[PDB]
């Protein structure tokens, strides 16, 4: 339940966060993947859920 995780982070804090923003706050508090939350990002964007932007050579997320 990455997704979830991710998307209620995403709206609790109400603030943009990097692919690694997001699976480095979440490692130590829910310890979820690497690809777990990337894959989690874009299943959440694809839903509708959140929204993303990439900035150079990393993508940032938020929700929305």
């Known amino acids: 339940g990455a997704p ?12 943009p966060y990097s692919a ?8 130590k508090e829910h310890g979820l993947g690497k690809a777990a939350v990337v894959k989690a990002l874009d299943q959440l964007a694809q ?10 050579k990393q993508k940032i997320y938020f929700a929305d």
Request: aromatic share 10%.
């Open 20 to 27: 690694q923003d997001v699976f480095g706050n979440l490692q």
């Open 4 to 15: 979830g995780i991710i998307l209620r982070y995403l709206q609790e804090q109400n603030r």
């Open 47 to 56: 839903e509708g859920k959140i929204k993303e932007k990439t900035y150079g």
